[PDB]
Design an enzyme around this catalytic site. Structure first.
Site, short mmCIF file in Angstrom:
data_model
loop_
_atom_site.label_atom_id
_atom_site.label_comp_id
_atom_site.label_asym_id
_atom_site.label_seq_id
_atom_site.Cartn_x
_atom_site.Cartn_y
_atom_site.Cartn_z
N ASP A 287 -9.84 -2.71 -8.15
CA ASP A 287 -8.55 -3.33 -7.79
C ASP A 287 -8.77 -4.33 -6.66
O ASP A 287 -9.91 -4.47 -6.12
CB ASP A 287 -7.46 -2.27 -7.57
CG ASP A 287 -6.06 -2.73 -7.91
OD1 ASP A 287 -5.79 -3.99 -7.85
OD2 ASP A 287 -5.22 -1.86 -8.26
N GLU A 493 4.57 -2.77 -6.34
CA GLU A 493 3.57 -1.99 -5.55
C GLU A 493 4.31 -1.35 -4.38
O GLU A 493 5.41 -0.81 -4.57
CB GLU A 493 2.35 -2.81 -5.19
CG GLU A 493 1.55 -3.21 -6.36
CD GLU A 493 0.31 -4.06 -6.11
OE1 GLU A 493 -0.69 -3.52 -5.66
OE2 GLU A 493 0.30 -5.27 -6.46
#
Ligand SMILES: CO[C@@H]1O[C@H](CO)[C@@H](O)[C@H](O)[C@H]1S[C@@H]1O[C@H](CO)[C@@H](O)[C@H](O)[C@H]1O
Ligand SMILES: *[C@@H]1O[C@H](CO)[C@@H](O)[C@H](O)[C@H]1NC(C)=O
Ligand SMILES: *[C@@H]1O[C@H](CO)[C@@H](O)[C@H](O)[C@H]1NC(C)=O
Ligand SMILES: *[C@@H]1O[C@H](CO)[C@@H](O)[C@H](O)[C@H]1NC(C)=O
Length: 604
Positions: A287, A493
């Protein structure tokens, strides 16, 4: 020919091409393949000089606002011309978050987010959405989509709950059909765990985020998932096996931890399980600054980040900015014997395997004839179908004896459309749309709920819009009925993490003003279940529309009865956030609406 190079021969088997190229590479060329950089830090010299293997656009990383498909293709091809100019001519792969359509791009079709797709229980619909998404990604010259998210969200306080198809692993497993939609179907013979992409009209896919991203304490994004191995394997892992069986090309690692071990440092899971047990042979990608986040504070020992991640088994690092520091540290670790050449060679074997398999050496450049796939009407028709199928009818009358409100009649003298979400394209798309966090207003090409109502009604029907009318405006207006749309603002997020799950004001107050004056259909726009008893108590009918995307006519297709409501909840609707987490088998399972609930209507 005399100047024959086996890796450049399209007739040769992929594994022979991989081994032929690997055997020629210098350590700098090998570490360059492992490096993925943001377009914001890329230039032709950077890409050539550091032998870069991949670029990405993060959310909102675009060549300019409003860029056309050709502008994207010209940007990607510019970066590719630089990579193809290196000694070995290894093409880069360009990745992007195309997670509900090609969502960073102006004029791209924006499909419902994954939670509403879960509501459809229609894997073939999801495959068709993968197919349409691959075409709109290739319209922009991009070869690699960071999708699907196969998180199994177990707590809706998570900011990424909308990116999960369901709290039920079986639904998430069913929706792994996105993978052969994006990549193409794997052949009859196919070995589970091998990567696959059919060719230049398809994209590489990415099963993410490995593993237990949906299981974190209190839904805190990137945090710890505390569950024994049996529960990790029973809930969080199963859809990764479906992904292997379908040939997913890449796997992205989670920021989250499992019982206190960072996934980005977990050799047992990334090498021991994913590579060695599931036989995954594609590439593993970090990520974004995922290896920086192994440490507390993030980025406080980048040398350790590099060692821990690469020894854990990651193949490609989404740096994405500090590439000089990444390449320098990794080169020093190999030079020092801390990281063996066997590990570098495995990482590069996997990256090249994906690139050769997907045809990237044969078709490294964009196809200008694909540009017109962006926003095509057939794809919008598909998104409209998906949006309508995603809707969950929670209420359709205040008492058992009232006339059902839905479907509404298209012919009425005057109707009211109200609420913050009735005419706000950005709100109906939610996060990962044009910007990273999403945005407000007319951010792309689409149809709002108000526009969809105006497009649906009889010509004699007068449509009045008021965003936040007061009670007297409604009672005095001569309205037949109202459609009132409210809900969550866009988020992505950790911005989305939310312990109270109450929609912003003035939403409930607007529903109460409207519904107190005239019969009302409330359309709730959210990424997840939210506190809903007050909205229900005010409303004649209430629809959970999730984040339906650019095609607002999917909402009106069910409100006005062109189609019946068919969606069913893909997650539990809680009575109170103090219940959470609360899942479809615990001791305290006391839902407002159980998983699978949904009222129906018949088409009029
Ligand atoms: C401007 O974006 C931010 O840039 C700084 C450094 O210049 C990074 O450290 C930040 O993490 C990003 S925030 C956000 O991250 C997303 C991935 O989580 C990415 O997709 C998006 O482009 C970024 O805006
Ligand atoms: C979880 O979040 C807390 C509070 O922000 C933080 O201090 C802790 O390190 C996080 N844990 C993990 C594993 O990320
Ligand atoms: C609920 O949580 C969000 C952020 O997590 C916050 O912005 C909002 O104001 C909170 N609402 C209430 C009423 O506490
Ligand atoms: C809708 O269709 C079915 C018949 O297949 C029926 O049982 C149901 O009650 C109907 N409801 C209506 C028409 O409102």
């Amino acid at each position: 020919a005399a100047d024959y190079v086996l890796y450049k021969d399209a007739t040769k088997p992929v594994e022979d091409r991989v081994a032929d190229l690997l055997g020629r590479m210098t350590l700098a060329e090998k570490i360059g393949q492992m490096t993925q950089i943001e377009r914001l830090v890329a230039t032709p010299d950077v890409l050539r000089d550091n032998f870069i293997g991949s670029l990405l656009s993060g959310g909102g990383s675009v060549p300019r606002k409003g860029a056309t498909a050709k502008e994207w293709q010209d940007m990607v091809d510019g970066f590719q011309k630089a990579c193809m100019s290196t000694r070995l001519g290894i093409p880069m792969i360009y990745g992007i978050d195309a997670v509900h359509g090609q969502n960073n791009v102006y004029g791209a079709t924006i499909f419902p987010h994954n939670v509403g797709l879960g509501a459809t229980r229609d894997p073939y619909l999801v495959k068709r959405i993968g197919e349409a998404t691959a075409l709109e990604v290739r319209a922009t010259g991009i070869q690699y989509a960071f999708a699907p998210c196969i998180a199994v969200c177990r707590d809706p306080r998570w900011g990424r709950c909308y990116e999960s198809y369901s709290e039920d692993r079986r639904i998430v497993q069913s929706m792994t059909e996105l993978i052969p939609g994006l990549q193409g179907d794997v052949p009859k013979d196919f070995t589970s765990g091998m990567p696959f992409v059919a060719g230049k009209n398809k994209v590489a896919a990415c099963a993410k985020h490995f593993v237990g991203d949906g299981g974190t304490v209190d839904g805190i994004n990137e945090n710890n998932t505390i569950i024994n191995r049996e529960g990790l394997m029973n809930i969080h892992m199963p859809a990764y096996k479906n992904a292997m069986d379908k040939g997913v090309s890449t796997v992205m690692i989670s920021y989250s931890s499992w019982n206190g071990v960072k996934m980005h440092a977990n050799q047992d899971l990334v090498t021991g399980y994913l590579k060695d047990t599931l036989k995954f042979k594609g590439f593993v990608i970090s990520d974004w600054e995922g290896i920086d986040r192994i440490t507390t504070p993030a980025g406080s020992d980048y040398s350790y980040s590099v060692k821990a991640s690469i020894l854990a088994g990651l193949d490609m690092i989404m740096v994405p900015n500090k590439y000089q520091q990444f390449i320098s540290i990794l080169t020093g670790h190999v030079n020092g014997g801390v990281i063996p050449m066997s590990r570098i060679d495995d990482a590069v074997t996997r990256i090249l395997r994906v690139k050769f398999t997907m045809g990237l050496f044969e078709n490294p450049y964009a196809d200008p004839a694909m540009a017109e796939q962006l926003g095509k009407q057939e794809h919008r028709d598909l998104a409209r179908e998906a949006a309508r199928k995603s809707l969950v009818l929670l209420k359709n009358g205040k008492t058992s004896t009232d006339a059902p409100l839905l479907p509404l009649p298209k012919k009425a003298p005057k109707i009211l459309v109200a609420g913050s979400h009735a005419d706000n394209l950005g709100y109906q798309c939610g996060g990962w749309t044009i910007e990273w966090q999403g945005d407000t207003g007319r951010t792309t090409v689409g149809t709002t709920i108000l526009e969809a109502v105006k497009a649906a009604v009889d010509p004699s029907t007068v449509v009045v819009f008021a965003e936040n009318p007061d009670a007297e405006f409604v009672k005095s207006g001569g309205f037949s009925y109202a459609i009132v749309a409210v809900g969550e603002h866009p988020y992505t997020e950790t911005k989305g993490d939310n312990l109270n799950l109450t929609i912003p004001e003035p939403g409930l107050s607007t529903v109460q003003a409207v519904c107190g004056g005239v019969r009302c259909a409330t359309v709730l726009i959210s990424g997840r279940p939210v506190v809903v008893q007050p909205l229900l108590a005010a409303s004649d009918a209430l629809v959970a529309a999730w984040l339906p995307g650019s095609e607002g006519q999917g909402v009106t297709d069910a409100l006005f009865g062109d189609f019946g409501f068919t969606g069913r909840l893909p997650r539990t609707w809680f009575k109170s956030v103090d219940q959470l987490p609360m899942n479809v088998g615990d001791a305290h399972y006391d839902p407002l609406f159980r998983l699978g609930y949904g009222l129906t209507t018949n088409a009029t």
